[PDB]
Every structure is written in structure tokens, then in C-alpha cells.
Design a protein around this ligand. Structure first.
Ligand SMILES: CCc1nc2c(C)cc(N3CCN(CC(=O)N4CC(O)C4)CC3)cn2c1N(C)c1nc(-c2ccc(F)cc2)c(C#N)s1
Ligand SMILES: CC(=O)N[C@@H]1[C@@H](O)[C@H](O)[C@@H](CO)O[C@H]1O
Ligand SMILES: *[C@@H]1O[C@H](CO)[C@@H](O)[C@H](O)[C@H]1NC(C)=O
Ligand SMILES: [Ca+2]
Ligand code: NA
Ligand SMILES: [Zn+2]
Ligand SMILES: [Zn+2]
Length: 787
């Protein structure tokens, strides 16, 4: 009927009965008077000196009367101009040791101020452009930058913040999407983006509601101005205890729009950032009028950054593919290719990949079968993600035909590139009681934030991709303390059993031995990795390395070893080139056969521990054990040999020694999780030897580089890779030249976290350290970007 006193109501209303909520416009189910009651614009948003001590006029946008505080619907600057109060920004920065909330408040509220396309380097502008945001950043907990998820677009990142999930998990994989099961398209413009079926996981507002914690609107109907959104949140905070929600969200479309139109480094970006700051100023002043400015948790977060991208810097598939009218492309800062129609038979992914692979010297994109995309992107396991994907170089675009892209140039900026690119990095600020005071924190991924916001609201988080405890160093008080998971599979330590005579593996070499002593104290600085799944594996000790050999996979799950700064690098002797010796501690049955590698013309082998960095000539013979070999393509051996021969020593030289934990990964269903035996598709020809899809390497050192890797009492420094086990090096366009030119570039592109490896290996590292477990969780979430 009417929105008499029901403006922006938080309850549900079953059809009919016209609703007056924040989504009534988008479905067009608002009452006739909604606009002339709830969207009042009369006499602006700011109180004036001549409006102070006025009688209540209901038509006014915000009130400047005496009862406005009791009513809880004043203008944000009411007390400042009338009661002679100061702006929140003008006040001296004061530590919030305890939440200062009125009686009735059971928990301190949470305000999420999300800013679309907010570049991390905009904070450099400082108090001159953004005085209010500078105060929040300087006073509360802030990071130099926050890492978004790929693709670095609005919808995937905002819903990643909401759910703590990778876009492939929560299902919003882009602003543009096609689902083959629905046979419908999701777009930035359309009614289909309001359909619930597209949205997966459990966002913060659902988690809160189902645990008895009431939540305000997270979406605002497009035609509700920024000033009204702030006033509506401040009105909700004035509601009684039983009706008042504890979690709110504000979303601004700036400075994205101005970022696209003018560019990141544009002088026209100042005003849009002044505008954002004023909106924040209205909130903080508004909270101060309600006496909630030292009660409420404020998160100032962005979804992504912005890069200099021009229309003249565009690649066209018409200069690669002969028939362009056969494929549908999702163009711009990324590429997703599928068939235009399902009726087409000639459509071959293999031919399209080949045609797009290193054709031009200065090619500004690289084609990938989604399973071959870097694992750190976690962008494959979803039916809305197309098999063919193009990773576009920063500052560049990819279109189907030249006529697709348009005038002189409409856009000078864009986003959606690799999430490790500096220009795509966004902001996080945490102001309030539960957050720390004048505290800088290392950069972290936005996937982690859902866990933190749940902790602020005292909620049990839904199973997500955040490492719970990794952001405990953000908070003054922690409601969750993390615990190491219990080991499921206890290790075996098998002695000498089977004699060289019994081993008929079809092998040859042409040529105590295996004991513990310094093997643990030197080559396990951070303890034995725990196996978190039922499987039979053995602990094998050597003088140079220690490994956890699997009897099911017939190879090590992990191989740990340590190289000092003054460590020697020797060559593989010519008379030990094809040397592969049987391990007396393991049975012939639970061992690889060298015959299988001769039958398989495509598959060679390599060693997890390098013979190159053997302590003595006698110790090098331990490197040629059958329990230290893994199936490897000749193409990959070029990458792995260089790493082991050159780079493993190079790191030890610069990082004053390094501990290396190397091993295989099986992920044929590309879900980023450890494969079971049945899920392995490819084995070595005529054998039960499973072919790893990737090979990982956890390279740990001392943060204080003055101290060596062993005898490091201070914090730890870590870098990790997950190199794809490819039968070719087509990913590397310069693979023709010496390994030094290309191999290192490939590794930095396939950089990874420890958590990424732990998910893919089902292992748990850094179990015996001098560090707190929450500090280790941060070390495990750390990603070396090389930017
Ligand atoms: C481009 C901005 C935007 N536009 C929309 C639109 C049109 C709809 C929309 N949704 C998403 C939620 N969905 C209904 C819903 O409650 N659920 C479907 C799930 O099962 C739970 C459909 C409506 C989110 N939108 C968003 N997003 C992603 C927003 N970000 C947030 C957000 C996310 C995290 C934050 F920390 C703060 C704000 C919003 C919310 N709610 S508004
Ligand atoms: C929100 C989400 O993605 N949940 C899935 C879950 O359904 C599945 O059972 C699990 C193991 O595969 O992986 C994850
Ligand atoms: C992300 O979280 C979801 C839900 O817990 C899970 O299904 C998925 O496997 C997780 N991803 C990884 C890489 O662990
Ligand atoms: Ca898997
Ligand atoms: Na090549
Ligand atoms: Zn955005
Ligand atoms: Zn944008």
C-alpha cells in the first residue's frame, strides 16, 4: 500500500504488498510513494547555520531539528555546524583499547566500505586529497596493498570478499559468463544477474542471519545516491536492540568509472577520490553523532586496481585464426574462447591453441588450456570457465576482429589482468576496537577477509579458501585460535630387507650407507611434513636428503634437503649418466621399473634430490636410488635440470643457504586438490607408475639473511613454485635459446603459496619451528610475485 514509515525495511514481504526495501526498484515492485517518501532530496544533505533549531519538516532529505538525534535521522554534519562539534577527521587520533558502545549492543557492529577499482598507490596522494581515509589508514590496521582474485573484475572479487572463496568455487568467474547446463548468459547489464542459481558458497550476510546475527543490505538499488546510503545505515544503527543489525555494507562505483575514462595516473582522478573521502567523512561524522565512532568496526576495502590500457594497444585473433566467425570470445584484459554454436563439428581446441602459440615476436597474449593456467590463479574447476583461455599482458587488450574495437578512444584505463600485477593491487584498512592501533601488516589475499569479518561478528565461518588464523595479527582480540591438523598416516622406517639379487626391475648403473644422525637436524629444519590422508609411505634417510616414499604412487610425496652458502656444485659423472640403483629398504613390488621408461618413448625420468649438489662423490650414489626418481618428459627435464644445477645454488648464495622440499603433484581433474589413485588418467606406458601433472619446490631460508638457514632463531623467508609437467615448452616462446633466457621466467610465472601445495599434496609443512602457529599460517599464505 504505502511506505509511510517502512522506508528501506530489512524484512521480507511476500507478493503482493508493494515493498520499500533496497531491491524494490530492480524488480520494479516499489509503492507509488516510495520515491516521494524514502528518496527525499529537499535542502541537500548538509545542515546550514540558519537551519539549526528548526521545527520538523517531513519533506526534508535529512533533519536539522532538536529531536533528530532522538529520532535518529539528522544530517551527518548536524552537530558540527549547530552544536559546535568537530569533524571526526579534525579530532586527534586516540587508541580504542575497548569498544565504547551504548547499553543493549551485544557485539560491536561491522561497516564494510567497498570501493570499486581502488588502486593501492592512490593512498600515496595522502591527506591532501583524502584526509578522512588517511586517518583510518594511519590510526587503524592497514596493508601496503591487498591481492584480489583472478580475473581482477568487480563481480568475482566483491563476491570473493563476501564468501572467502575463489571465483571457480563461488561460481562468479567474470562480469560476463555463459553456463552450459542453464543455457543462459550472466552479464553486468541484465535481469539474469539477480537470479540466485548463479551465486554459490555462503556470503557473510547469509552466514550471519543463519547464526542469529541480523544483517543490513549489501546491495543498493542503482538509483539511490551515496549520501542516502550513509543516512540509511546510520538510521538502521538507531533502531532498537531486537531489530538493529550488526553487519552493514556500503559500495561505491568510483573511482573505477573515472579510472576507465581518464586512466590511473590522471589529474581528473583527484575529485573522484575527494568524493569518496567526503562519503567516508559523512559516515564517520554520522557515527560520532550516534556515539558509535569508537564502537563500530570499519573496513575500507577495494575489489581491484587499474592499469593504463588504450584502444591502440589491442591484439586481434583475426591475425592468427583464419575463421573468426566460428568462435565466441570474452574480450578485453582477459580472453575466454568457445564455439559460437554447438552445431559446428570442425571446432578443434588443439588447432586454435597451436594457431595462437608464439606466432609474433612481440605477442601481448599467451593461450592456455585452463588446466595449464598457473595454479596460483585457481581458475579452472567450473563449467562457466571456457577450456581455451588467454592471459593478456598488462596495458593491452584482445578482441575477435578490428571492427569490434571504436572511435578515437573512449577508455584510457581497464582491469582484469593477472592478480599479481602491481596495477591490479587494491587497498585494505581496518579501523575500530577489534583492529590494532597504528599497525602496518604485510600484503594478503582478499580470500582471507571472510574469516576475519566472521571473527569481528563472532560467527562460525563457512568452509572457505581462507587460512583461518593467518590474519590473527590484524586483530587486537582473537575469537579463533588455530590448531595443527592430526596426522592420519603414521610413517614407516624400513631397514635392509630385500637383496640386490631379488630386484628384477630391468635396470643398470655401471659402478653406514642409509642412516640418521645429521639427516633430521640439517635436512628437516622445520620438522617432518605430516600426511593428512590414509596411505602407506616410508621415511628414507640419506647423508644429503630425506624423503617420504609412497608405496601406492611408487615415488616420494616429499624430498627435503639443505644447501649452505659455501656448498659445492659438481657435474653428473658420464659413467653414472643412466645409473638407477634399487633401494634394499623397499620391496621390488612397491618400486618403479626402469624397463617402463624404455618402452615409453615420450617419458624419460629425473631425480627430486639433485646429484649435482651431492656432499661427496660417495654421497652422489644415494641420488641415483630408484626411490628418488620420478617420471619426467625430456621437455620438462630442461626446466628441472637448470633449476637443480644452477638456481638451487644461486638461491643458497644470495639467501645465505636454503632448505628445499621438492615432490610431485597429481591434479588431472584440476580442482586444486590432491588426486586419489582412481582420478589419475595417465600412467607410464605398460606400468602402474602414475605421471605427476606438476612438480612443487618449497625453498625456505632465514628472513635475517646474516644468519644461515640452519641456526635461524628469527623469522623465516619462503619462496615456492608449482611447475606444470608439460611434454613441450610451447608456454615459453624463447625455449629455443639457452635455459638461462626462459626457464627462470616460467618459474616466476608459476610461483605459488605453501597452502596451494598442501591442498595439492595433502601434506602439512613447518610443524617443528620456533614460531607461533598463526605466524606460520601467514608464512604459508605468502606469495613471491617478483614485481
Ligand atoms: C556490481 C555490483 C553488484 N551488483 C549486484 C547485483 C545486481 C546483484 C547482486 N546479488 C548477489 C546476491 N544474490 C542474492 C543473495 O542474497 N544470494 C544468492 C546467494 O545464495 C545469496 C543476488 C543479488 C550483487 N551485486 C553486486 N555485488 C557483487 C555487490 N557487492 C556487494 C558486496 C560484497 C562484499 C562486501 F564486503 C561488500 C559488498 C554487494 C552485495 N550484496 S553489491
Ligand atoms: C563452495 C564449494 O566450492 N564447495 C565445494 C564442495 O561442494 C565440494 O564437496 C568440495 C570437495 O570437492 O569442494 C568445495
Ligand atoms: C575452496 O573452498 C571450497 C569450499 O570449502 C572447496 O570445495 C574447494 O576445494 C576449496 N579450494 C581449494 C583449492 O582448496
Ligand atoms: Ca585433483
Ligand atoms: Na618451443
Ligand atoms: Zn570493479
Ligand atoms: Zn571497471
Amino acid at each position: 500500500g504505502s511506505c509511510k514509515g517502512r522506508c528501506f525495511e530489512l524484512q521480507e514481504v511476500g507478493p503482493p504488498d508493494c515493498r520499500c526495501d533496497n531491491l524494490c526498484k530492480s524488480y520494479s515492485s516499489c509503492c507509488h510513494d516510495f520515491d516521494e517518501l524514502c528518496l527525499k532530496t529537499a535542502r541537500g544533505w548538509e545542515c546550514t547555520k540558519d537551519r539549526c533549531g528548526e521545527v520538523r519538516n517531513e519533506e526534508n532529505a535529512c533533519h536539522c531539528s532538536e529531536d533528530c538525534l532522538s529520532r535518529g535521522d539528522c544530517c551527518t554534519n548536524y552537530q558540527v555546524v549547530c552544536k559546535g562539534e568537530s569533524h571526526w577527521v579534525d579530532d586527534d587520533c586516540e587508541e580504542i583499547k575497548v569498544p565504547e558502545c551504548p547499553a543493549g549492543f551485544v557485539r560491536p557492529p561491522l561497516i564494510i566500505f567497498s570501493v570499486d577499482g581502488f588502486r593501492a598507490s592512490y593512498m600515496k596522494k595522502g591527506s591532501k586529497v583524502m584526509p578522512n581515509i588517511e586517518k583510518l589508514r594511519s590510526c587503524g590496521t592497514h596493508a601496503p596493498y591487498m591481492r584480489p582474485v583472478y580475473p581482477t573484475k568487480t563481480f568475482p572479487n566483491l563476491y570473493t570478499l563476501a564468501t572467502g572463496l575463489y571465483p571457480e568455487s563461488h561460481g562468479i568467474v567474470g562480469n560476463s559468463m555463459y553456463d552450459p547446463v542453464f543455457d543462459a548468459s550472466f552479464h553486468l547489464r541484465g535481469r539474469e544477474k539477480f537470479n540466485h542459481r548463479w551465486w554459490g558458497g555462503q556470503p557473510l550476510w547469509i552466514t550471519a542471519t543463519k547464526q542469529g546475527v541480523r544483517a543490513g543490505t549489501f546491495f543498493w538499488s542503482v538509483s539511490i545516491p551515496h549520501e542516502r546510503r550513509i543516512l540509511t545505515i546510520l538510521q538502521w544503527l538507531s533502531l532498537p536492540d531486537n531489530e538493529r543489525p550488526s553487519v552493514y555494507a556500503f559500495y561505491s562505483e568510483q573511482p573505477d568509472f573515472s579510472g576507465h575514462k581518464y586512466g590511473p595516473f590522471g589529474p581528473e582522478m583527484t575529485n573522484p577520490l575527494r568524493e569518496i573521502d567526503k562519503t567516508v567523512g559523512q559516515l564517520m561524522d554520522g557515527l560520532k553523532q550516534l556515539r558509535l565512532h569508537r564502537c563500530v568496526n570499519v573496513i575500507f576495502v577495494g575489489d581491484h586496481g587499474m592499469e593504463d590500457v588504450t584502444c591502440d594497444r589491442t591484439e586481434f585473433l583475426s591475425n592468427y585464426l583464419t575463421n573468426v566467425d566460428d568462435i565466441t570470445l570474452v574480450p578485453g584484459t582477459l580472453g575466454r574462447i568457445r564455439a559460437k554454436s554447438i552445431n559446428n563439428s570442425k571446432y578443434d581446441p588443439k588447432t586454435i591453441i597451436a594457431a595462437l602459440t608464439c606466432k609474433k615476436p612481440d605477442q601481448h597474449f599467451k593461450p592456455y588450456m585452463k588446466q595449464h593456467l598457473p595454479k596460483r590463479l585457481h581458475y579452472a574447476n567450473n563449467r562457466r570457465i571456457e577450456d581455451i583461455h588467454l592471459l593478456v599482458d598488462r596495458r593491452w587488450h584482445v578482441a575477435r576482429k578490428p571492427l569490434d574495437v571504436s572511435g578515437k578512444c573512449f577508455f584510457q584505463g581497464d582491469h582484469g589482468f593477472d592478480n599479481k600485477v602491481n596495477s591490479m593491487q587494491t587497498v585494505f584498512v581496518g579501523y575500530g576496537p577489534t583492529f590494532k592501533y597504528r599497525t602496518k601488516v604485510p600484503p594478503f589475499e582478499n580470500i582471507e577477509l571472510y574469516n576475519v569479518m566472521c571473527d569481528l561478528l563472532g560467527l562460525k565461518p563457512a568452509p572457505n579458501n581462507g587460512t583461518h588464523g593467518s590474519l590473527n595479527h590484524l586483530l587486537r582480540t582473537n575469537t579463533f585460535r588455530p590448531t595443527m591438523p592430526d596426522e592420519v598416516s603414521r610413517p614407516n622406517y624400513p631397514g635392509i630387507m630385500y637383496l640386490q639379487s631379488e630386484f628384477d626391475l630391468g635396470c643398470t648403473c655401471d659402478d653406514r650407507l642409509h642412516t640418521k644422525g645429521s639427516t633430521k637436524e640439517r635436512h628437516l629444519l622445520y620438522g617432518r611434513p605430516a600426511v593428512l590422508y590414509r596411505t602407506s609411505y616410508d621415511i628414507l634417510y640419506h647423508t644429503d636428503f630425506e624423503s617420504g616414499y609412497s608405496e601406492i604412487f611408487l615415488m616420494p610425496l616429499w624430498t627435503s634437503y639443505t644447501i649452505s652458502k659455501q656448498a659445492e656444485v659438481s657435474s653428473i659423472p658420464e659413467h653414472l649418466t643412466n645409473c638407477v640403483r634399487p633401494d634394499v629398504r623397499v620391496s621390488p613390488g612397491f618400486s618403479q621399473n626402469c624397463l617402463a621408461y624404455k618402452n615409453d618413448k615420450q617419458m624419460s625420468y629425473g631425480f627430486l634430490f639433485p646429484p649435482y649438489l651431492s656432499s661427496s662423490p660417495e654421497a652422489k650414489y644415494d641420488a641415483f636410488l630408484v626411490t628418488n626418481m620420478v617420471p619426467m618428459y625430456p621437455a620438462f627435464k630442461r626446466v628441472w635440470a637448470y633449476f637443480q644445477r644452477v638456481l638451487v645454488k644461486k638461491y643458497a648464495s644470495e639467501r645465505n643457504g636454503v632448505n628445499v622440499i621438492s615432490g610431485p603433484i597429481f591434479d588431472y581433474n584440476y580442482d586444486g586438490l590432491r588426486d586419489t589413485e582412481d582420478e589419475i588418467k595417465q600412467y607410464v606406458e605398460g606400468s602402474s607408475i602414475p605421471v605427476p601433472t606438476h612438480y612443487y619446490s618449497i625453498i625456505t631460508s632465514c628472513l635475517d639473511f646474516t644468519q644461515p638457514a640452519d641456526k635461524c632463531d628469527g623469522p623465516l623467508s619462503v619462496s615456492s613454485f608449482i611447475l606444470p609437467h608439460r611434454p613441450d615448452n610451447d608456454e615459453s616462446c624463447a625455449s629455443s635459446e639457452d635455459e638461462s633466457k626462459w626457464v627462470e621466467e616460467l618459474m616466476k610465472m608459476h610461483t605459488a603459496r605453501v597452502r596451494d601445495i598442501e591442498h595439492l599434496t595433502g601434506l602439512d609443512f613447518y610443524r617443528k619451528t620456533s614460531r607461533s602457529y598463526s605466524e606460520i599460517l601467514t608464512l604459508k599464505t605468502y606469495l613471491h610475485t617478483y614485481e
